[PDB]
Amino acid sequence: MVQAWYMDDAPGDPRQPHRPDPGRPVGLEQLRRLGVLYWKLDADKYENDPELEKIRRERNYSWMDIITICKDKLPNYEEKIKMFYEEHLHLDDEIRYILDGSGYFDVRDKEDQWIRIFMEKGDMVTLPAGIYHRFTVDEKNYTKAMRLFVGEPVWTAYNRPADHFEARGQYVKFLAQT
Ligand SMILES: [Fe+2]
């Protein structure tokens, strides 16, 4: 089971439950078609069960680590949180696993629709590259999740807009001509 809302027919007001009239919850299967993948494992069962590593092999993930979010335990909160706070696009994939804490991930559909997805402990989520997304969890102001990336940590130093790069940007222009 996955927790998410189809705000496509719901009011932008965050305070509201975003329950359309009639109301309709996100379709887990619908998102999978969108290219969204999620792993259900117990953080405690993750380390005790390298099986999660097996999933990495399928997604070609050689680098993995455990990251926790906290103002006091996460120096550089303003820039770090603001950097991923804004929605951006790029040719890189997004793999996040919530070992602990509560939060939600922002995803976009090809139909130009936005869905609010809630991330729970033990629930992992993957966002295909080339799709806009926004990660937030300020509601709890304390979330612990693992991140899986391939190659050198690009996030360490990256440009907001993916198109910013001629090679990673100019290439995108070719798609427009398609
Ligand atoms: Fe991203």
Swiss-Prot record:
The UniProt entry, under Pfam families, shows:
ARD
| Chief site of localization | cytoplasm
Q: What GO terms in the biological process aspect are recorded for it? A: L-methionine salvage from methylthioadenosine; methionine metabolic process
What's the impact of mutating E94A?
A: Loss of aci-reductone dioxygenase activity
Provide the tissue specificity.
Answer: Detected in heart, colon, lung, stomach, brain, spleen, liver, skeletal muscle and kidney.
Entry's localization field: Cytoplasm; Nucleus; Cell membrane
> Looking at the UniProt record for this protein, which Gene Ontology cellular component terms does it annotate, in alphabetical order?
cytoplasm; cytosol; nucleus; plasma membrane
According to its UniProt record, this protein's enzyme class is: oxidoreductase
Q: Name one GO molecular function term.
A: iron ion binding
Q: Where is this region: Disordered?
A: 7-26
Pathway assignment reads: Amino-acid biosynthesis; L-methionine biosynthesis via salvage pathway; L-methionine from S-methyl-5-thio-alpha-D-ribose 1-phosphate: step 5/6
Reaction catalysed? 1,2-dihydroxy-5-(methylsulfanyl)pent-1-en-3-one + O2 = 4-methylsulfanyl-2-oxobutanoate + formate + 2 H(+); 1,2-dihydroxy-5-(methylsulfanyl)pent-1-en-3-one + O2 = 3-(methylsulfanyl)propanoate + CO + formate + 2 H(+)
- Which positions are annotated as binding Ni(2+)? H88, H90, E94, H133
Cofactor, free-text remark: Binds either 1 Fe or Ni cation per monomer. Iron-binding promotes an acireductone dioxygenase reaction producing 2-keto-4-methylthiobutyrate, while nickel-binding promotes an acireductone dioxygenase reaction producing 3-(methylsulfanyl)propanoate.
Per UniProt, what is the membrane topology?
Peripheral membrane protein
Q: Which InterPro entries match?
A: ARD, ARD_euk, RmlC-like_jellyroll, RmlC_Cupin_sf
Q: Which residues bind Fe(2+)?
A: H88, H90, E94, H133
Q: Which UniProt keywords apply?
A: Amino-acid biosynthesis, Cell membrane, Cytoplasm, Dioxygenase, Iron, Membrane, Metal-binding, Methionine biosynthesis, Nickel, Nucleus, Oxidoreductase
Note the superkingdom of the native organism: Eukaryota
Q: EC number(s) on record?
A: 1.13.11.54, 1.13.11.53
Q: How does it assemble?
A: Monomer. Interacts with MMP14.
- Give the protein's biological function: Catalyzes 2 different reactions between oxygen and the acireductone 1,2-dihydroxy-3-keto-5-methylthiopentene (DHK-MTPene) depending upon the metal bound in the active site. Fe-containing acireductone dioxygenase (Fe-ARD) produces formate and 2-keto-4-methylthiobutyrate (KMTB), the alpha-ketoacid precursor of methionine in the methionine recycle pathway. Ni-containing acireductone dioxygenase (Ni-ARD) produces methylthiopropionate, carbon monoxide and formate, and does not lie on the methionine recycle pathway. Also down-regulates cell migration mediated by MMP14.
Family that this chain belongs to: Belongs to the acireductone dioxygenase (ARD) family.
Can you say what this protein is called?
Acireductone dioxygenase
- The gene designation is ADI1
